[PDB]
Amino acid sequence: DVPVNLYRPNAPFIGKVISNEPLVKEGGIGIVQHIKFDLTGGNLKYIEGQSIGIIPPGVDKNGKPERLRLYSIASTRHGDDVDDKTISLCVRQLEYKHPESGETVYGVCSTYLTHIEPGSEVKITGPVGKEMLLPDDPEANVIMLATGTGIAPMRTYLWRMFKDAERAANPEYQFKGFSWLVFGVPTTPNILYKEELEEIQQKYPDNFRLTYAISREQKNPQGGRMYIQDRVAEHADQLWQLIKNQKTHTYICGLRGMEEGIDAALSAAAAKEGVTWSDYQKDLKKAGRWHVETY
Ligand SMILES: Cc1cc2nc3c(=O)[nH]c(=O)nc-3n(C[C@H](O)[C@H](O)[C@H](O)COP(=O)(O)OP(=O)(O)OC[C@H]3O[C@@H](n4cnc5c(N)ncnc54)[C@H](O)[C@@H]3O)c2cc1C
Numbered sequence: 343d344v345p346v347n348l349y350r351p352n353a354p355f356i357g358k359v360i361s362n363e364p365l366v367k368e369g370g371i372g373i374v375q376h377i378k379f380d381l382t383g384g385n386l387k388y389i390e391g392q393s394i395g396i397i398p399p400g401v402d403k404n405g406k407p408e409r410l411r412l413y414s415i416a417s418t419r420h421g422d423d424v425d426d427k428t429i430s431l432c433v434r435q436l437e438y439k440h441p442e443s444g445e446t447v448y449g450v451c452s453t454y455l456t457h458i459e460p461g462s463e464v465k466i467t468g469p470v471g472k473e474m475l476l477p478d479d480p481e482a483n484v485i486m487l488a489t490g491t492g493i494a495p496m497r498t499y500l501w502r503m504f505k506d507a508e509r510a511a512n513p514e515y516q517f518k519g520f521s522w523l524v525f526g527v528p529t530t531p532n533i534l535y536k537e538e539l540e541e542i543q544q545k546y547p548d549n550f551r552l553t554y555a556i557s558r559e560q561k562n563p564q565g566g567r568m569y570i571q572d573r574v575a576e577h578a579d580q581l582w583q584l585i586k587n588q589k590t591h592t593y594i595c596g597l598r599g600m601e602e603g604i605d606a607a608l609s610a611a612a613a614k615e616g617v618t619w620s621d622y623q624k625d626l627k628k629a630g631r632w633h634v635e636t637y
Contacts, residue, residue: 345387354465355384370531373435375456390498391474397465398451411451414494424507432494483590489526492596526555526570571603582611598636
Protein backbone atom coordinates (compact mmCIF):
# COMPACT_ATOMS: atom_id res chain seq x y z
CA ASP A 343 0.00 0.00 0.00
CA VAL A 344 3.05 2.24 0.51
CA PRO A 345 4.81 3.21 -2.76
CA VAL A 346 8.59 2.84 -2.51
CA ASN A 347 11.28 3.16 -5.18
CA LEU A 348 9.02 3.52 -8.21
CA TYR A 349 12.02 5.32 -9.70
CA ARG A 350 15.68 4.58 -8.93
CA PRO A 351 18.94 6.52 -9.59
CA ASN A 352 19.84 4.46 -12.71
CA ALA A 353 16.68 5.61 -14.52
CA PRO A 354 15.08 8.59 -12.76
CA PHE A 355 11.80 10.30 -13.51
CA ILE A 356 12.28 13.51 -15.49
CA GLY A 357 9.79 16.04 -14.15
CA LYS A 358 9.34 19.70 -15.01
CA VAL A 359 9.32 22.63 -12.61
CA ILE A 360 5.98 24.41 -12.54
CA SER A 361 6.67 27.08 -9.93
CA ASN A 362 9.39 28.24 -7.55
CA GLU A 363 8.08 30.64 -4.87
CA PRO A 364 10.02 32.27 -2.01
CA LEU A 365 8.83 31.41 1.50
CA VAL A 366 11.11 33.69 3.51
CA LYS A 367 9.63 37.21 3.68
CA GLU A 368 11.49 40.53 3.80
CA GLY A 369 13.47 40.89 7.01
CA GLY A 370 14.10 37.16 7.36
CA ILE A 371 17.28 35.09 7.30
CA GLY A 372 18.32 32.98 4.34
CA ILE A 373 16.46 31.58 1.34
CA VAL A 374 13.77 28.90 1.46
CA GLN A 375 11.78 28.09 -1.68
CA HIS A 376 8.56 26.21 -2.38
CA ILE A 377 9.10 24.25 -5.61
CA LYS A 378 6.33 22.37 -7.43
CA PHE A 379 6.96 19.73 -10.08
CA ASP A 380 4.86 18.30 -12.87
CA LEU A 381 4.43 14.54 -12.51
CA THR A 382 2.46 13.91 -15.71
CA GLY A 383 4.13 11.44 -18.06
CA GLY A 384 5.17 9.07 -15.28
CA ASN A 385 3.78 6.89 -12.50
CA LEU A 386 5.31 8.52 -9.41
CA LYS A 387 2.90 8.00 -6.55
CA TYR A 388 3.64 8.91 -2.95
CA ILE A 389 1.99 9.48 0.41
CA GLU A 390 2.48 11.79 3.39
CA GLY A 391 5.74 11.60 5.33
CA GLN A 392 7.86 10.31 2.44
CA SER A 393 10.87 11.80 0.64
CA ILE A 394 12.13 11.97 -2.93
CA GLY A 395 15.67 12.22 -4.28
CA ILE A 396 16.93 14.95 -6.62
CA ILE A 397 20.01 14.36 -8.77
CA PRO A 398 21.78 17.72 -9.32
CA PRO A 399 23.73 18.32 -12.54
CA GLY A 400 27.49 18.51 -12.76
CA VAL A 401 30.47 16.79 -11.19
CA ASP A 402 32.11 17.03 -7.77
CA LYS A 403 35.75 18.13 -7.33
CA ASN A 404 37.02 14.63 -8.22
CA GLY A 405 35.20 14.59 -11.56
CA LYS A 406 32.46 12.16 -10.51
CA PRO A 407 28.70 12.65 -11.16
CA GLU A 408 26.86 14.36 -8.32
CA ARG A 409 24.76 11.92 -6.31
CA LEU A 410 21.18 12.38 -5.11
CA ARG A 411 20.10 14.42 -2.10
CA LEU A 412 16.86 13.53 -0.26
CA TYR A 413 14.10 16.06 0.34
CA SER A 414 10.94 15.59 2.42
CA ILE A 415 7.82 15.77 0.27
CA ALA A 416 6.01 19.01 1.17
CA SER A 417 2.68 18.20 -0.51
CA THR A 418 0.02 15.61 0.31
CA ARG A 419 -0.43 12.66 -2.07
CA HIS A 420 -2.77 14.86 -4.12
CA GLY A 421 -0.45 17.79 -4.72
CA ASP A 422 -1.05 21.44 -3.81
CA ASP A 423 -3.83 21.79 -6.39
CA VAL A 424 -5.42 18.51 -5.32
CA ASP A 425 -5.30 17.11 -8.86
CA ASP A 426 -2.87 14.19 -8.35
CA LYS A 427 -0.50 15.60 -10.98
CA THR A 428 2.21 17.38 -8.95
CA ILE A 429 4.66 17.17 -6.03
CA SER A 430 6.23 19.96 -3.94
CA LEU A 431 9.48 20.46 -2.02
CA CYS A 432 10.56 22.91 0.70
CA VAL A 433 14.23 23.63 0.07
CA ARG A 434 16.56 25.88 2.03
CA GLN A 435 19.72 27.15 0.35
CA LEU A 436 22.75 25.87 2.25
CA GLU A 437 25.72 28.23 2.60
CA TYR A 438 28.50 28.53 5.18
CA LYS A 439 31.89 29.34 6.60
CA HIS A 440 35.53 30.40 6.09
CA PRO A 441 37.03 27.35 7.82
CA GLU A 442 35.96 25.22 4.83
CA SER A 443 38.09 26.33 1.82
CA GLY A 444 37.59 29.82 0.36
CA GLU A 445 35.02 32.16 1.89
CA THR A 446 31.37 31.18 1.48
CA VAL A 447 30.53 27.73 0.15
CA TYR A 448 27.21 27.12 -1.60
CA GLY A 449 25.53 23.74 -1.45
CA VAL A 450 25.28 22.14 -4.89
CA CYS A 451 21.78 20.65 -4.90
CA SER A 452 20.06 23.26 -2.71
CA THR A 453 21.51 26.17 -4.72
CA TYR A 454 20.52 24.33 -7.90
CA LEU A 455 16.97 23.86 -6.65
CA THR A 456 16.33 27.28 -5.11
CA HIS A 457 17.38 29.03 -8.33
CA ILE A 458 15.67 26.65 -10.75
CA GLU A 459 13.41 28.04 -13.48
CA PRO A 460 9.88 26.95 -14.40
CA GLY A 461 10.05 24.67 -17.42
CA SER A 462 13.34 23.11 -16.33
CA GLU A 463 13.66 19.32 -16.27
CA VAL A 464 14.61 17.64 -13.00
CA LYS A 465 15.82 14.12 -12.15
CA ILE A 466 13.55 12.64 -9.47
CA THR A 467 13.80 9.29 -7.67
CA GLY A 468 11.65 7.58 -5.04
CA PRO A 469 9.46 7.80 -3.12
CA VAL A 470 11.35 6.60 -0.04
CA GLY A 471 10.62 6.36 3.68
CA LYS A 472 8.21 4.53 5.96
CA GLU A 473 9.38 6.18 9.17
CA MET A 474 7.24 9.33 9.03
CA LEU A 475 3.90 7.99 7.85
CA LEU A 476 0.57 9.20 9.25
CA PRO A 477 -1.88 6.79 10.93
CA ASP A 478 -5.20 6.42 9.12
CA ASP A 479 -6.86 6.73 12.54
CA PRO A 480 -8.99 9.94 12.51
CA GLU A 481 -9.01 10.12 16.31
CA ALA A 482 -5.23 10.07 16.69
CA ASN A 483 -3.45 12.84 18.52
CA VAL A 484 -0.52 14.20 16.52
CA ILE A 485 2.35 16.10 18.14
CA MET A 486 4.65 17.82 15.64
CA LEU A 487 8.07 19.15 16.63
CA ALA A 488 9.74 20.94 13.71
CA THR A 489 12.55 23.38 12.99
CA GLY A 490 13.17 25.13 9.68
CA THR A 491 12.53 22.85 6.71
CA GLY A 492 11.36 20.10 9.03
CA ILE A 493 8.00 21.85 8.57
CA ALA A 494 7.73 19.89 5.27
CA PRO A 495 6.28 16.55 6.40
CA MET A 496 4.15 18.44 8.95
CA ARG A 497 2.51 20.48 6.19
CA THR A 498 1.46 17.25 4.43
CA TYR A 499 -0.27 15.98 7.59
CA LEU A 500 -1.95 19.29 8.41
CA TRP A 501 -3.21 19.88 4.87
CA ARG A 502 -4.62 16.35 4.73
CA MET A 503 -6.18 16.97 8.14
CA PHE A 504 -7.56 20.47 7.66
CA LYS A 505 -7.70 21.70 4.05
CA ASP A 506 -11.25 21.80 2.69
CA ALA A 507 -10.37 20.33 -0.73
CA GLU A 508 -8.46 17.52 0.97
CA ARG A 509 -11.44 16.72 3.21
CA ALA A 510 -13.64 16.55 0.10
CA ALA A 511 -11.05 14.35 -1.64
CA ASN A 512 -10.43 11.92 1.25
CA PRO A 513 -13.85 10.64 2.44
CA GLU A 514 -12.15 7.93 4.52
CA TYR A 515 -10.10 10.43 6.56
CA GLN A 516 -12.02 13.14 8.39
CA PHE A 517 -9.67 14.19 11.17
CA LYS A 518 -11.17 14.84 14.61
CA GLY A 519 -8.27 14.20 16.95
CA PHE A 520 -5.95 16.85 18.36
CA SER A 521 -2.77 18.11 16.72
CA TRP A 522 -0.12 20.46 18.07
CA LEU A 523 2.69 22.01 16.05
CA VAL A 524 5.69 23.49 17.82
CA PHE A 525 7.64 25.30 15.10
CA GLY A 526 11.16 26.63 15.66
CA VAL A 527 12.40 29.44 13.39
CA PRO A 528 14.71 32.49 13.78
CA THR A 529 12.31 35.31 12.85
CA THR A 530 8.63 35.93 12.15
CA PRO A 531 9.37 36.37 8.44
CA ASN A 532 10.95 32.90 8.60
CA ILE A 533 7.74 31.16 9.66
CA LEU A 534 7.29 29.07 6.54
CA TYR A 535 3.61 28.94 5.51
CA LYS A 536 2.67 31.31 8.34
CA GLU A 537 -0.58 32.48 6.75
CA GLU A 538 -1.90 28.98 6.00
CA LEU A 539 -0.90 27.58 9.40
CA GLU A 540 -2.69 30.42 11.19
CA GLU A 541 -5.82 30.03 9.06
CA ILE A 542 -6.01 26.40 10.18
CA GLN A 543 -5.77 27.47 13.83
CA GLN A 544 -8.68 29.90 13.26
CA LYS A 545 -11.01 27.32 11.68
CA TYR A 546 -10.11 24.48 14.04
CA PRO A 547 -9.28 26.00 17.46
CA ASP A 548 -10.22 22.72 19.18
CA ASN A 549 -8.24 20.44 16.83
CA PHE A 550 -5.01 22.38 16.22
CA ARG A 551 -2.67 24.28 18.48
CA LEU A 552 0.16 26.34 17.05
CA THR A 553 3.20 27.29 19.12
CA TYR A 554 6.23 29.24 17.89
CA ALA A 555 9.77 29.41 19.18
CA ILE A 556 11.28 32.48 17.52
CA SER A 557 14.85 32.96 18.66
CA ARG A 558 15.64 36.51 17.51
CA GLU A 559 12.38 37.78 19.00
CA GLN A 560 11.84 35.73 22.16
CA LYS A 561 13.95 34.91 25.21
CA ASN A 562 13.68 31.81 27.41
CA PRO A 563 13.52 32.06 31.23
CA GLN A 564 17.32 31.88 31.49
CA GLY A 565 17.82 34.89 29.20
CA GLY A 566 18.92 33.10 26.04
CA ARG A 567 17.25 32.87 22.65
CA MET A 568 14.01 30.87 22.48
CA TYR A 569 14.53 27.54 20.75
CA ILE A 570 12.11 24.66 20.26
CA GLN A 571 13.63 22.80 23.23
CA ASP A 572 12.81 25.77 25.43
CA ARG A 573 9.17 25.60 24.31
CA VAL A 574 9.04 21.83 24.86
CA ALA A 575 10.33 22.27 28.44
CA GLU A 576 7.67 24.93 29.01
CA HIS A 577 4.91 22.45 28.12
CA ALA A 578 6.67 19.20 29.11
CA ASP A 579 3.97 18.11 31.58
CA GLN A 580 1.17 18.57 29.02
CA LEU A 581 3.15 16.90 26.23
CA TRP A 582 3.85 13.92 28.49
CA GLN A 583 0.18 13.56 29.42
CA LEU A 584 -0.78 13.46 25.73
CA ILE A 585 2.02 11.00 24.92
CA LYS A 586 0.54 8.53 27.43
CA ASN A 587 -2.59 8.25 25.26
CA GLN A 588 -2.51 5.09 23.13
CA LYS A 589 -3.66 7.14 20.12
CA THR A 590 -0.92 9.75 20.22
CA HIS A 591 1.88 9.90 17.66
CA THR A 592 4.88 12.24 17.88
CA TYR A 593 6.83 13.52 14.85
CA ILE A 594 10.21 15.24 15.07
CA CYS A 595 11.82 16.71 11.96
CA GLY A 596 14.51 19.26 11.25
CA LEU A 597 18.25 19.73 11.52
CA ARG A 598 20.17 17.27 13.69
CA GLY A 599 20.66 18.03 17.38
CA MET A 600 17.11 18.96 18.37
CA GLU A 601 16.33 15.51 19.82
CA GLU A 602 18.58 15.94 22.88
CA GLY A 603 16.70 18.90 24.35
CA ILE A 604 13.32 17.30 23.69
CA ASP A 605 14.31 14.18 25.62
CA ALA A 606 15.66 16.04 28.67
CA ALA A 607 12.36 17.91 29.04
CA LEU A 608 10.26 14.76 28.56
CA SER A 609 12.59 12.85 30.90
CA ALA A 610 12.01 15.24 33.81
CA ALA A 611 8.25 15.06 33.20
CA ALA A 612 8.08 11.24 33.04
CA ALA A 613 10.31 10.88 36.13
CA LYS A 614 7.63 12.51 38.32
CA GLU A 615 5.46 9.44 37.74
CA GLY A 616 8.25 6.88 38.11
CA VAL A 617 8.73 6.28 34.38
CA THR A 618 12.16 6.23 32.75
CA TRP A 619 11.66 8.18 29.50
CA SER A 620 14.44 6.47 27.51
CA ASP A 621 12.86 3.11 28.34
CA TYR A 622 9.37 4.39 27.54
CA GLN A 623 10.60 5.92 24.27
CA LYS A 624 12.01 2.58 23.03
CA ASP A 625 8.60 0.94 23.40
CA LEU A 626 7.06 3.89 21.51
CA LYS A 627 9.53 3.39 18.64
CA LYS A 628 8.82 -0.34 18.39
CA ALA A 629 5.10 0.42 18.55
CA GLY A 630 5.51 2.81 15.62
CA ARG A 631 4.42 5.89 17.57
CA TRP A 632 7.70 7.82 17.76
CA HIS A 633 8.82 9.23 14.41
CA VAL A 634 12.16 10.96 13.90
CA GLU A 635 13.78 12.42 10.78
CA THR A 636 16.68 14.79 11.41
CA TYR A 637 19.49 15.71 9.03
C1 LIG B 1 15.48 12.44 4.82
C2 LIG B 1 16.02 13.83 4.52
C3 LIG B 1 15.17 14.80 4.26
C4 LIG B 1 15.61 16.10 3.98
N1 LIG B 1 14.71 17.05 3.73
C5 LIG B 1 15.07 18.27 3.42
C6 LIG B 1 14.04 19.34 3.16
O1 LIG B 1 12.82 19.16 3.17
N2 LIG B 1 14.53 20.60 2.85
C7 LIG B 1 15.88 20.91 2.81
O2 LIG B 1 16.25 22.06 2.55
N3 LIG B 1 16.77 19.91 3.09
C8 LIG B 1 16.44 18.63 3.37
N4 LIG B 1 17.39 17.72 3.68
C9 LIG B 1 18.89 17.96 3.51
C10 LIG B 1 19.19 17.85 2.02
O3 LIG B 1 19.17 16.50 1.61
C11 LIG B 1 20.62 18.23 1.58
O4 LIG B 1 21.56 17.67 2.55
C12 LIG B 1 20.85 19.75 1.78
O5 LIG B 1 19.86 20.37 0.97
C13 LIG B 1 22.17 20.22 1.40
O6 LIG B 1 22.53 19.62 0.13
P1 LIG B 1 23.44 20.45 -0.90
O7 LIG B 1 23.54 19.65 -2.08
O8 LIG B 1 22.83 21.77 -0.94
O9 LIG B 1 24.84 20.51 -0.12
P2 LIG B 1 26.46 19.72 -0.23
O10 LIG B 1 26.78 20.50 -1.43
O11 LIG B 1 26.55 18.25 -0.18
O12 LIG B 1 26.95 20.35 1.04
C14 LIG B 1 26.77 19.60 2.18
C15 LIG B 1 28.09 19.19 2.71
O13 LIG B 1 28.91 20.35 3.08
C16 LIG B 1 29.16 20.28 4.49
N5 LIG B 1 28.42 21.29 5.36
C17 LIG B 1 27.06 21.56 5.44
N6 LIG B 1 26.73 22.48 6.33
C18 LIG B 1 27.95 22.88 6.93
C19 LIG B 1 28.30 23.85 7.98
N7 LIG B 1 27.45 24.65 8.69
N8 LIG B 1 29.60 23.97 8.31
C20 LIG B 1 30.49 23.20 7.65
N9 LIG B 1 30.31 22.28 6.67
C21 LIG B 1 28.99 22.15 6.34
C22 LIG B 1 29.11 18.76 4.80
O14 LIG B 1 30.32 18.08 4.36
C23 LIG B 1 27.85 18.36 4.00
O15 LIG B 1 27.96 16.98 3.66
C24 LIG B 1 16.99 16.41 3.96
C25 LIG B 1 17.89 15.35 4.23
C26 LIG B 1 17.44 14.10 4.49
C27 LIG B 1 18.50 13.05 4.77
